[PDB]
Ligand binder design. Structure first.
Ligand SMILES: *[C@H](O)[C@H](C[C@@H]1CCNC1=O)NC(=O)[C@@H]1[C@@H]2[C@H](CN1C(=O)OCc1ccccc1)C2(C)C
Ligand SMILES: *[C@H](O)[C@H](C[C@@H]1CCNC1=O)NC(=O)[C@@H]1[C@@H]2[C@H](CN1C(=O)OCc1ccccc1)C2(C)C
Lengths: 306, 306
């Protein structure tokens, strides 16, 4: 037993991380087969970075301007192109450590592992959720751009995120691996700001089920509620509405605990209206919303990846 | 910016994980050079497990009783010996992925990354602290024994933990890689229980400094306190005493924020006596004690590992 915010093993991604330097900018790239993917703002200079025209900037570039280093070994760039907000640098060597991978775009409410990197060297790994406002609450310093987020499904790495920037509230914004931003953000220095967030209701319920599975039961009650009456209380506390599909997705966790989804909703209602009154749930004094029903089932069952 | 519970990249450890099966017991082993390390209770059967004599049990074993699988490849066991509570299985192949490593034993209050594994396959990675009572609050199911905890220092993996068992409160106990248990526990089914824990005071202060670095300042005050007067309040709330060495270790974080250690202690005092009053610190409604001053400096600066 036990319940921890758990990332996927990072090894398959570590073998893809490289350093990309152009002019005075150094950041990370993702090396898959013979292509290195990196944020296109690597072509910028600090006076380019306020209102750049990236096509203009890229046509003035040469292959040899891009210094790509995989560990202590230089990769020769033999072609370059822009795809939305990422650059694809064609190099003369296919990465022999390329895992089976996909490029997927995730939904708000979904989680993934981030491999924080600097100078092409992995620094740390942690779990993030895509917020309803398309930001992520990460940990990113200068030089971390090009770090990727991912999930692993058996032996296959589904890359879903590349880091590009920090917003003024200290949250983070980036793209999918096709270079399309999550949310209404641009790789421009503007006055852009995150925008109002909400709490991921289905995830809170999944985490409550994780708590029950692990022996935290004090918040359970005999009450119940209708989906409609629960959703009235949801909005009120700035929680996302709960759909019948969410109820369906929680079925397995309901069947394992013997607690009907709607009964767990009644528990959540009381927690929202009363607080926790000095008590904790899975070591937290807050209702946690960054675990999906999948994350709970995986960890409270023990799936692996080879 | 941002602050997240961050594990080390797990790749170097993933390459060492194997499956060890003996009789009806399957667990994980750690394969370094030509030795596989695993918990000695792999030699047990469910009727052995109440009060076993492990030397007796081991002399009745044969090399061929131990099935070791590294991925889909069987490793021939050519020797075996017991070292305290771990088994060393000598195999006919040195692990070509053996990283530079050390076997270190950590102190309570210190943190490390756990690579949860099942059937020799890594499942997830997360950060744990050694509690003052020598348990860890992990996430471990049946089959997870032999998963290891570690830190990485440049390119060197310092293994500090091997998982053996869960205690009745749902916390976890294990050994260093020399097979010596952390804390007063035995790999026997008895009525053993964790024992009273305390909060790691120096770590709470480090996390407060992490908060300030990231723009949470509401808990700061103009008051100060003496080390002695702070430690009176510490005990009271079941916090560990703060030593002058702890104050010294917090010096760099004090110098970066401009907040004297003793002033941050005065802030902690008020948080202990008043609570947080609906507010959060780094997304937590509790005072977090599983980040060391090192962890804060690493993440709020950006060290990597190659
Ligand atoms: C790429 O390594 C960097 C990552 C930032 C740096 C601080 N935290 C991060 O996540 N990305 C950027 O610097 C982007 C880039 C330039 C502005 N920018 C950005 O994040 O601005 C906000 C910021 C910068 C530095 C420190 C705090 C906040 C453009 C092209 C958007
Ligand atoms: C090894 O894979 C297993 C890991 C346990 C299983 C549940 N959570 C864990 O961390 N270790 C054991 O089963 C050890 C082993 C036998 C008893 N034991 C143990 O942990 O007992 C408590 C327990 C067991 C199963 C489920 C919940 C709690 C001995 C030799 C100590």
């Amino acid at each position: 037993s036990g319940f921890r915010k758990m990332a996927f093993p990072s090894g398959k991604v570590e073998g893809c991380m490289v350093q990309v330097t152009c002019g005075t900018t150094t950041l990370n790239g993702l090396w898959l087969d013979d292509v290195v993917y990196c944020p296109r703002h690597v072509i910028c200079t600090s006076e380019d970075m306020l209102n750049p025209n990236y096509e203009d900037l890229l046509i003035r570039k040469s292959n040899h301007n891009f210094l790509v280093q995989a560990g202590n070994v230089q990769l020769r760039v033999i072609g370059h192109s822009m795809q939305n907000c990422v650059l694809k640098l064609k190099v003369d060597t296919a990465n022999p450590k390329t895992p089976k991978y996909k490029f997927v775009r995730i939904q708000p409410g979904q989680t993934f592992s981030v491999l924080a990197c600097y100078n092409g060297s992995p620094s740390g790994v942690y779990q993030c959720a895509m917020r309803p406002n398309f930001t992520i609450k990460g940990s990113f310093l200068n030089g971390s751009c090009g770090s990727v987020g991912f999930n692993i499904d058996y032996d296959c790495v589904s890359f879903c995120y590349m880091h590009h920037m920090e917003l003024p509230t200290g949250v983070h914004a980036g793209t999918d691996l096709e270079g399309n931003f999550y949310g209404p953000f641009v790789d421009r220095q503007t006055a852009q700001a995150a925008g109002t967030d909400t709490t991921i209701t289905v995830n809170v319920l999944a985490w409550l089920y994780a708590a029950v599975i692990n022996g935290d039961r004090w918040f359970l009650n005999r009450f119940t509620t209708t989906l409609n009456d629960f959703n009235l209380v949801a909005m009120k506390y700035n929680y996302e509405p709960l759909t019948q599909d969410h109820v369906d997705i929680l079925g397995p966790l309901s069947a394992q605990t013997g607690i009907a989804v709607l009964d767990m909703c009644a528990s959540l209602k009381e927690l929202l209206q009363n607080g926790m009154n000095g008590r904790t749930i899975l070591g937290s004094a807050l209702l946690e919303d960054e675990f999906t029903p999948f994350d709970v089932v995986r960890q409270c069952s023990g799936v692996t990846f080879q």
